[PDB]
């Protein structure tokens, strides 16, 4: 039932830029149960932050989580050119795994 | 080496059934957690099922009852097998414990 | 006194008829505090 | 220009984002020296 509320839906920034992806969940979600998904146009599922502060194996530090209960935070310091992708959040906390709705990152 | 491989895709009359296939490379399907995601067309991504390594196995309340998800060792193969399929049910599903995705039309 | 980290006091008031020494007589002084203070003290003064 | 203050201040409205909020912070931060313990808890009896 844990619905995640990604805003925005859509974001256009420049490169350089620092693009915060804001993610809030309906219930305070239990020791930052936050998973952040990177999903290239017509390409698979890639993760970025476990547990909302643990990176992924691989992904660049310019990727940061952040939040706490029902707010996360999904921080990319210095924009890429490759990271104009869609990035979805998934909560965990709950039987009923659920993810958020996506947020768009524009040129 | 490590290598998920998902088959079983296709288009679907409504109400039929299916069953997935998840190659494995490199892992070890029942000592490693098991899960399949689903992605509907510009949708986000929904976890349905999930299977434990040691046998437990749990399944998404809106596939509850229709779906049913198991692995042959003997293969080292993850299976997702869908039962009373619909409309809602076209996604994307691509195996994790991922893989590549696979499209399914119903 | 003071001893495994406990300062401990025993007191007493007792009335007295003299003027001038100790008298002659017994008692005792049963506790009246007890202080963790785990602090090691080798001096003191007395404060009129 | 090349000379910053370290210091700077928390903006605090209520309209600010859920994890941009103030959020009222006790650091609980226990010792257990040599020293004899001192702040214990308040055990219930029964009837006698």
């Known amino acids: 039932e844990i619905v995640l509320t990604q805003s925005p839906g859509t974001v256009s920034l420049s490169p350089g830029e620092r693009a915060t992806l804001s993610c809030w969940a309906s219930?305070?979600?239990?020791?930052?149960?936050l998973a952040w998904y990177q999903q290239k146009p017509g390409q698979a599922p890639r993760l970025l932050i476990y547990?909302?502060?643990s990176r992924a194996t691989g992904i660049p530090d310019r990727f940061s989580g952040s939040g706490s209960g029902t707010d996360f935070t999904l921080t990319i310091s210095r924009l890429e050119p490759e990271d104009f992708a869609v990035y979805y959040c998934?909560?965990?906390?709950?039987?009923?795994?659920?993810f958020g709705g996506g947020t768009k990152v524009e040129i | 080496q490590v290598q998920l491989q998902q088959w079983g895709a296709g288009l679907l009359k409504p109400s039929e059934t299916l069953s997935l296939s998840c190659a494995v490379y490199?892992?070890?399907?029942?000592?490693?957690?098991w899960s399949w995601i689903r992605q509907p067309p510009g949708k986000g991504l929904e976890w349905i099922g999930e299977?434990?390594?040691?046998?437990?196995?749990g399944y998404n309340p809106s596939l509850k009852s229709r779906v049913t998800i198991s692995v042959d060792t003997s293969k080292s193969q993850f299976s997702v097998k869908l039962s009373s399929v619909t409309a809602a049910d076209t996604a994307v599903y691509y195996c994790?414990?991922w893989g590549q995705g696979t499209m399914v039309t119903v | 006194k003071n001893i495994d980290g406990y300062f401990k006091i025993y007191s007493k008031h007792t009335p007295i008829n003299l003027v001038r020494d100790l008298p002659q007589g017994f008692s005792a002084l049963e506790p009246l505090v007890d202080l963790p203070i785990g602090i090691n003290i080798t001096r003191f003064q007395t404060l009129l | 220009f090349n000379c910053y203050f370290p210091l700077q201040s928390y903006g605090f409205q209520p309209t600010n984002g859920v994890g941009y909020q103030p959020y009222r912070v006790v650091v609980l931060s226990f010792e257990l020296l040599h020293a004899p313990a001192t702040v214990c808890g308040p055990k219930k009896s029964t009837n006698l």
């Open positions: 219930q305070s979600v239990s020791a930052s149960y």
């Open positions: 998934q909560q965990y906390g709950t039987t009923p795994r659920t």
């Open positions: 299977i434990n390594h040691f046998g437990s196995t």
């Open positions: 547990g909302a502060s």
């Open positions: 490199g892992g070890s399907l029942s000592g490693y957690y």
């Open positions: 994790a414990r």
